[PDB]
Amino acid sequence: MLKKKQLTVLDLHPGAGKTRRVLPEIVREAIKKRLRTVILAPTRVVAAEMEEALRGLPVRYMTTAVNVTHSGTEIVDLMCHATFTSRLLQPIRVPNYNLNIMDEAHFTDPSSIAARGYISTRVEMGEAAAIFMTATPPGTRDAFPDSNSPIMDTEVEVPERAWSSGFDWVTDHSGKTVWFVPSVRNGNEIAACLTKAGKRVIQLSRKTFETEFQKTKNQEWDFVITTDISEMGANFKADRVIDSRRCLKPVILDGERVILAGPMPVTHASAAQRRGRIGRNPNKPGDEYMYGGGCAETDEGHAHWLEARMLLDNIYLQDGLIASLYRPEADKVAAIEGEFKLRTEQRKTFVELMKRGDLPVWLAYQVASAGITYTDRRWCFDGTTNNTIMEDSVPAEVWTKYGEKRVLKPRWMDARVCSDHAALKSFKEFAAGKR
Numbered sequence: 001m002l003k004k005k006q007l008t009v010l011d012l013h014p015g016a017g018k019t020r021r022v023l024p025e026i027v028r029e030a031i032k033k034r035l036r037t038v039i040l041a042p043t044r045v046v047a048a049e050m051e052e053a054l055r056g057l058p059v060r061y062m063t064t065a066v067n068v069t070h071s072g073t074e075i076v077d078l079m080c081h082a083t084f085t086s087r088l089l090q091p092i093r094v095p096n097y098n099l100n101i102m103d104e105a106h107f108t109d110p111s112s113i114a115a116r117g118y119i120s121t122r123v124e125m126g127e128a129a130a131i132f133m134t135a136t137p138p139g140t141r142d143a144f145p146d147s148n149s150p151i152m153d154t155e156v157e158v159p160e161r162a163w164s165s166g167f168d169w170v171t172d173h174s175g176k177t178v179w180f181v182p183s184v185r186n187g188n189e190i191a192a193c194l195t196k197a198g199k200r201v202i203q204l205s206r207k208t209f210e211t212e213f214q215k216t217k218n219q220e221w222d223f224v225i226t227t228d229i230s231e232m233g234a235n236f237k238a239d240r241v242i243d244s245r246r247c248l249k250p251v252i253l254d255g256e257r258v259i260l261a262g263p264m265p266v267t268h269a270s271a272a273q274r275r276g277r278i279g280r281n282p283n284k285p286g287d288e289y290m291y292g293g294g295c296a297e298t299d300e301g302h303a304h305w306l307e308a309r310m311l312l313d314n315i316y317l318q319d320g321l322i323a324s325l326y327r328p329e330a331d332k333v334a335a336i337e338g339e340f341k342l343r344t345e346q347r348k349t350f351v352e353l354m355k356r357g358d359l360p361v362w363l364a365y366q367v368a369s370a371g372i373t374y375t376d377r378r379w380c381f382d383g384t385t386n387n388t389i390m391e392d393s394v395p396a397e398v399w400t401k402y403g404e405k406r407v408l409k410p411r412w413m414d415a416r417v418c419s420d421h422a423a424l425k426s427f428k429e430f431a432a433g434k435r
């Protein structure tokens with residue numbers, strides 16, 4: 001794998017030991033061969049798990065999730081997928097790594113797709129080697145892969161709302177269950193229904209992931225209610241997965257707005273990853289997987305692939321050359337390479353709206369390409385009345401940086417900025433000039 005000009009896909013089934021057994025061997029061989037190496041973790045939680053598997057080896061942890069004293073002798077760097085892409089975008093030299101290892105290379109967040117595209121392009125140019133580690137590489141059609149111990153698979157109707165009757169099998173269980181819901185708001189409803197029935201419930205989402213995951217190891221629980229983020233290496237000591245088989249999909253309508261379509265079916269890769277949370281202990285057979293719908297190829301036309309092209313168009317590769325998306329996932333978006341290339345000043349605004357503003361890639365691009373500077377928030381208030389953001393069925397209001405009370409009515413509307421109370425609270429602070 002380690003020889004130049006080659007991309008290898010390590011596709012062992014979930015729980016086969018890619019992180020704790022294969023990754024340390026790869027690191028030893030890379031250090032022995034003097035290969036400048038990068039290890040890319042999907043999340044801060046996986047970076048902490050990787051430090052345990054690589055403990056002792058000279059690895060430089062470029063993350064605050066690990067508290068380790070770096071000796072300065074390391075030729076192997078470990079960072080999150082998003083940190084890699086962020087450093088590529090920023091005015092900072094990123095080493096031209098001889099070996100690029102990506103754990104959970106199935107992650108479909110825009111910054112993961114862009115990291116895959118940049119790395120595979122370097123490999124295609126014969127400049128580097130790469131290893132993409134995932135049980136479900138792009139193109140997988142098998143939602144029931146192998147496991148360490150047998151799994152009971154059962155197609156059943158799964159609640160997506162609070163219930164008074166008809167689902168005895170859910171509460172009549174004395175083990176631990178991980179439940180994948182289509183959204184944060186749907187998770188809040190089921191969590192409230194299970195809590196009222198006497199259950200201890202922990203909720204996980206992208207924004208609360210590091211803090212709340214700790215509680216799964218630190219306290220006794222009956223149910224973990226989570227969005228699709230737990231498909232990225234999150235491990236639990238559970239005997240059952242309940243899977244709605246549904247997700248929300250960001251969709252760009254007419255190139256003018258982003259809506260959250262669905263809930264709609266997950267891909268076969270997502271279903272296999274959600275199922276993959278159980279059946280991991282060979283000494284505990286009989287873990288259950290209850291699924292409530294079929295799979296579909298819902299990544300086609302999904303906004304993350306267009307957003308990944310917006311990231312790659314603004315990453316320097318060599319002169320005017322632009323990195324292409326990783327070949328098995330390049331048809332998920334109809335886009336010309338270079339069409340989102342911004343000039344130096346607007347590109348700096350684009351990065352800052354993402355990094356500091358915490359805005360979605362699509363929304364940051366609309367603001368920056370319009371020649372608006374980072375601190376100029378007038379666009380948050382001058383959109384059409386149909387772009388009015390609503391809070392509890394009444395128009396949301398903020399005090400502007402000028403001391404005037406205005407209705408939140410963005411010029412460009414992206415449903416991700418108000419999809420839940422936490423997201424809307426953060427967008428209100430942005431519109432007020434608080435960050």
Ligand SMILES: CC(C)(C)c1ncc2c(n1)CCNC2
Pocket residue numbers: 082083085086089111311354355358359360361
């Ligand atoms: C720089 C990069 C591409 C890694 C990034 N950072 C933060 C955010 C986003 N992207 C998009 C989602 N919103 C926050």
